[PDB]
Amino acid sequence: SLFGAIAGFIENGWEGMIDG
């Protein structure tokens, strides 16, 4: 899903971007 394309990026790349 588009939500998948959102959240599934976050499910790795989130933690380098928390301070956003």
Coordinates of C-alpha atoms in Angstrom, one line a residue:
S1 CA 0.0 0.0 0.0
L2 CA 0.9 3.7 -0.1
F3 CA 0.8 3.4 3.7
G4 CA 3.3 0.5 3.3
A5 CA 5.5 2.9 1.2
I6 CA 5.3 5.3 4.2
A7 CA 5.5 3.2 7.3
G8 CA 7.7 0.5 5.7
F9 CA 10.4 3.1 5.0
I10 CA 10.1 4.4 8.6
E11 CA 10.4 0.7 9.9
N12 CA 14.1 1.1 9.0
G13 CA 14.9 4.8 8.2
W14 CA 12.8 6.3 11.1
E15 CA 15.4 6.0 13.7
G16 CA 18.0 8.2 11.9
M17 CA 15.2 10.9 11.6
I18 CA 13.6 10.8 15.1
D19 CA 15.1 14.3 15.9
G20 CA 12.9 15.8 13.1

